Ligand SMILES: CC1=N/C(=C\c2cc(F)c(O)c(F)c2)C(=O)N1C
């Protein structure tokens with residue numbers, strides 16, 4: 374069924390990521406249900422350069438195993454990440470996405486900031 378993956382989400386997940394620059398991150402995603410198919414997300418964590426992660430976004434069912442994710446990170450100059458989480462097990466999801474925007478928060482979009490940058494990761498049920 375289309376909501377089988379969504380039904381697992383409500384609550385807190387441990388999240389680890391890797392970006393295209395070679396950095397890693399650790400933190401949490403918290404899902405708040407808004408319907409059988411949609412969730413609100415808040416995000417916290419730290420990048421391997423020490424920078425804090427603060428974000429909020431939304432999840433929407435796409436297939437029985439996947440959900441579309443859009444997250445904005447105020448702690449990272451309001452960069453926008455868009456991607457999909459794919460169910461791997463009842464307690465694990467895989468993350469594949471890309472982001473762009475004023476990551477360094479200086480108010481100007483540099484070349485590194487102008488195009489999409491890859492983001493991969495894993496979510497583990499806590
Ligand atoms: C661990 C974690 N990293 C997140 C985002 C994130 C991680 C990164 F390594 C980035 O370069 C970046 F632009 C965003 C997130 O929301 N969580 C929970």
Ligand SMILES: [Ca+2]
Pocket residue numbers: 475476477478479480481482483486
């Ligand atoms: Ca910038």
